[PDB]
Amino acid sequence: HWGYGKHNGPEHWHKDFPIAKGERQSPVDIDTHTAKYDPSLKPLSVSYDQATSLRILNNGHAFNVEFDDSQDKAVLKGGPLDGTYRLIQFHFHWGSLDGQGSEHTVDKKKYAAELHLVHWNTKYGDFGKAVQQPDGLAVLGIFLKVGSAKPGLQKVVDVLDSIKTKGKSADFTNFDPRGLLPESLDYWTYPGSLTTPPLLECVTWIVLKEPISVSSEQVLKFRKLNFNGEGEPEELMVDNWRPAQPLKNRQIKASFK
Ligand SMILES: NS(=O)(=O)c1ccc(-c2ccccc2)cc1
Numbered sequence: 001h002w003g004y005g006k007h008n009g010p011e012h013w014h015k016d017f018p019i020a021k022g023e024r025q026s027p028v029d030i031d032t033h034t035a036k037y038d039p040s041l042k043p044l045s046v047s048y049d050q051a052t053s054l055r056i057l058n059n060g061h062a063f064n065v066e067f068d069d070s071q072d073k074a075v076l077k078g079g080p081l082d083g084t085y086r087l088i089q090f091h092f093h094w095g096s097l098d099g100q101g102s103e104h105t106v107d108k109k110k111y112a113a114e115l116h117l118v119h120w121n122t123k124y125g126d127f128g129k130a131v132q133q134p135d136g137l138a139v140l141g142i143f144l145k146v147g148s149a150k151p152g153l154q155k156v157v158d159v160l161d162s163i164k165t166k167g168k169s170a171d172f173t174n175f176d177p178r179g180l181l182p183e184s185l186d187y188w189t190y191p192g193s194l195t196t197p198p199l200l201e202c203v204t205w206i207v208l209k210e211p212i213s214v215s216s217e218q219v220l221k222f223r224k225l226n227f228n229g230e231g232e233p234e235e236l237m238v239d240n241w242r243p244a245q246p247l248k249n250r251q252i253k254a255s256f257k
């Protein structure tokens with residue numbers, strides 16, 4: 001089964017998932033001098049005031065904070081998007097060292113981690129149908145650098161002890177994802193894919209220019225998670241990121257000068 005190790009990592013995924021070598025794979029390097037300002041791009045609309053978090057799950061490749069997406073409660077709209085996308089979950093990718101961990105890079109710079117807020121297009125009815133569509137998902141990507149602590153992240157950090165191993169979950173209600181956003185919503189956008197198998201080419205990527213800061217202690221606690229299940233040999237959940245993929249016939253657009 002796929003993973004991030006030497007024998008099952010990103011370089012192997014194409015054997016089970018041939019779309020890994022496709023025409024709109026993610027992540028990519030964001031070349032800031034080649035991205036073009038697009039004045040027709042609208043401001044992002046992040047409406048999270050009514051978000052309803054439910055659960056946090058260690059799925060063996062990251063941890064997901066899951067939301068109630070059975071109504072329009074937490075939605076992303078505007079920017080490059082047509083229509084309404086519902087928040088279903090967020091998760092992170094991170095490194096074994098502060099110098100790596102993000103999936104997207106900015107002028108080849110790697111950040112310590114990257115947050116993905118995953119939304120699906122409500123015109124397709126459910127997430128499973130949405131991932132089968134070229135405009136099925138909108139993922140909001142936010143970089144993390146190590147410095148000052150992010151207060152709104154601490155409730156996530158503090159529950160990780162209870163979901164140490166693959167397949168463990170914990171109640172996680174009343175978490176407000178607005179505490180994870182930077183001040184500015186300036187962004188780059190391009191058409192891409194899920195960054196884990198099945199690597200479906202169904203995502204409008206919206207990557208914020210401004211990173212959030214998290215403390216060394218906060219990201220340290222990410223690195224105490226396990227890829228393995230309970231009672232299996234311990235393998236730390238670190239470096240669960242896919243490296244940058246070829247941009248091919250795509251243009252990255254910027255919302256800002
Ligand atoms: N890292 S990501 O691009 O935001 C991503 C989100 C959901 C999924 C996923 C996992 C299982 C089934 C369908 C989609 C994969 C990747």
Ligand SMILES: [Zn+2]
Pocket residue numbers: 091092093116195
């Ligand atoms: Zn992700």
